[PDB]
């Protein structure tokens, strides 16, 4: 009873596949709920198209300024930003999906996506999902990141929804 939302992937334009993700309604109802209005695009705006502007291996992959397509912008569903919401879930591994954001109760639509146990994270980032299916694909996304964080190639959630 969780949603399951996807994103389909591609490099360059060329489809490198789907990854979906488990959004922990039950526990962060409120940024669940941000995540998913924002994969469906049901409010008008949204994650469709939107690049991945940030890829570290060995840390995160970073996405969701469909505003700005750079890290500095993005917005939710509920305004500009909004709280965090509670630190229950912690950062326990690959596949953990966490808001981004610029200090307290700062959430906007940036995420990232963990490949590395990430703790020091705990109680400063709100997880809020974890990879479902497609891990394969994240870490196949890694492969195109660097050390300063920058892309080799425009990767893009060229489709998006909910299953």
């Given at each position: 009873?969780?949603?399951?939302?996807?994103f389909?992937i591609?490099?360059?334009?060329?489809?490198?596949?789907?990854?979906?993700?488990?959004?922990?309604?039950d526990?962060?109802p409120?940024?669940?709920?941000?995540?998913?209005?924002?994969?469906?695009?049901?409010?008008?705006?949204?994650?469709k198209?939107?690049?991945?502007?940030?890829?570290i291996?060995?840390?995160?992959?970073?996405?969701?300024?469909?505003?700005?397509?750079?890290?500095?912008?993005?917005?939710?569903?509920?305004?500009?930003?909004?709280?965090?919401?509670?630190?229950?879930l912690?950062?326990?591994?690959?596949?953990?999906?966490?808001?981004?954001?610029?200090?307290?109760?700062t959430?906007?639509?940036?995420?990232?996506?963990?490949?590395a146990?990430?703790?020091?994270?705990?109680?400063?980032?709100?997880?809020?999902?974890?990879?479902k299916?497609?891990?394969?694909?994240?870490e196949?996304?890694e492969?195109?990141?660097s050390?300063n964080?920058?892309?080799?190639?425009?990767?893009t959630?060229?489709?998006?929804?909910?299953?």
């Amino acid at each position: 009873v969780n949603p399951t939302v996807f994103f389909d992937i591609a490099v360059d334009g060329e489809p490198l596949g789907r990854v979906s993700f488990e959004l922990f309604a039950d526990k962060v109802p409120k940024t669940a709920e941000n995540f998913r209005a924002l994969s469906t695009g049901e409010k008008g705006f949204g994650y469709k198209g939107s690049c991945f502007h940030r890829i570290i291996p060995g840390f995160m992959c970073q996405g969701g300024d469909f505003t700005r397509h750079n890290g500095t912008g993005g917005k939710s569903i509920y305004g500009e930003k909004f709280e965090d919401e509670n630190f229950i879930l912690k950062h326990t591994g690959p596949g953990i999906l966490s808001m981004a954001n610029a200090g307290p109760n700062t959430n906007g639509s940036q995420f990232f996506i963990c490949t590395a146990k990430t703790e020091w994270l705990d109680g400063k980032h709100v997880v809020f999902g974890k990879v479902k299916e497609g891990m394969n694909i994240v870490e196949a996304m890694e492969r195109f990141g660097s050390r300063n964080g920058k892309t080799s190639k425009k990767i893009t959630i060229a489709d998006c929804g909910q299953l």
